[PDB]
Structures are given as C-alpha cells and as structure tokens.
Amino acid sequence: MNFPNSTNLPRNPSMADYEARIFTFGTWIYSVNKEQLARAGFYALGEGDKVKCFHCGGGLTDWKPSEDPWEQHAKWYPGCKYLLEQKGQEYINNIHLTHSLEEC
Ligand SMILES: C[C@@H]1CN(CC(=O)N2CC(C)(C)c3ncc(Cc4ccccc4)cc32)[C@@H](CN2CCCC2=O)C[NH2+]1
Numbered sequence: 401m402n403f404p405n406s407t408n409l410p411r412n413p414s415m416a417d418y419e420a421r422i423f424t425f426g427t428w429i430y431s432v433n434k435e436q437l438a439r440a441g442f443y444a445l446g447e448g449d450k451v452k453c454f455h456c457g458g459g460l461t462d463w464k465p466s467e468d469p470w471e472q473h474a475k476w477y478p479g480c481k482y483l484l485e486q487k488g489q490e491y492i493n494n495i496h497l498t499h500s501l502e503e504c
C-alpha cells in the first residue's frame with residue numbers, strides 16, 4: 401500500500417541480519433519454511449504468515465506450500481535491490497517470464 405523501496409538502502413536496517421529476521425517468526429506453523437523466508441530477506445510481522453522484506457519493505461501473505469519465497473519476492477517486488485543483489489537479473493527475468501506465461 402506504501403510505495404516499494406527501490407533504493408540500494410534498506411528500509412528496515414534493524415532487520416538487515418539473517419539472525420534478526422529469524423527471531424521474528426517464533427514457533428512457525430506455516431507451510432513455508434522460516435529459514436527459507438529469512439534467506440529471501442523476509443521477517444515475520446506476528447499476524448498470520450504476513451512477512452515483509454527488510455530492504456524493499458514489501459509484504460506478502462497466505463503462503464501456499466507450492467509458493468517459493470524468492471519467486472514471490474521477484475513476482476510482487478521486482479524493483480527490490482536486495483533481491484537483485486542475491487539472485488541476479490537473469491534469475492529475475494526467468495521468474496517474470498515464467499509467471500507472465502503461467503497466465504497463458
Ligand atoms: C506468498 C503469496 C503472496 N501472494 C501475494 C500477496 O500476499 N500480496 C500481493 C500484494 C503485493 C498485492 C499484497 N498486498 C498486501 C498484502 C497483505 C500484507 C502482507 C504483509 C504486510 C502487509 C500487508 C499481500 C499482498 C498471495 C496472494 N494474495 C493475498 C492477498 C492479495 C494477493 O494477491 C499468495 N501467497
């Protein structure tokens with residue numbers, strides 16, 4: 401609902417460390433893996449399976465077991481500089497092409 405951060409500077413520097421993000425989940429009952437979420441730069445909000453990216457501030461919810469943290473990060477927050485640093489634009493393109501073709 402707020403604009404996504406597309407700068408090279410994290411919106412939430414307190415959540416810049418993997419272990420800082422890990423602590424936010426607590427006991428995690430959800431179908432998607434908390435360490436996989438923390439690696440894709442997500443931390444838990446404490447409200448269902450709502451996560452936000454530390455860098456772009458981008459929020460996601462309702463994780464199906466088929467949904468991949470990095471993939472969803474690229475789908476919904478393609479301007480994220482953290483995503484670009486970790487995954488590269490070749491990965492990012494692939495994923496975009498795949499979900500723009502998932503539609504048919
Ligand atoms: C893991 C996937 C994620 N999607 C997309 C999703 O979660 N998005 C895409 C969008 C950017 C439109 C969005 N904007 C708000 C929220 C809520 C929020 C979450 C964190 C913090 C603050 C608010 C979620 C959300 C879902 C499918 N959903 C669920 C709601 C709409 C949508 O497309 C499936 N699982």
Ligand code: NA
Nearest residue numbers: 425426427428
């Ligand atoms: Na918890």
Ligand SMILES: [Zn+2]
Nearest residue numbers: 453455456480
């Ligand atoms: Zn991000």
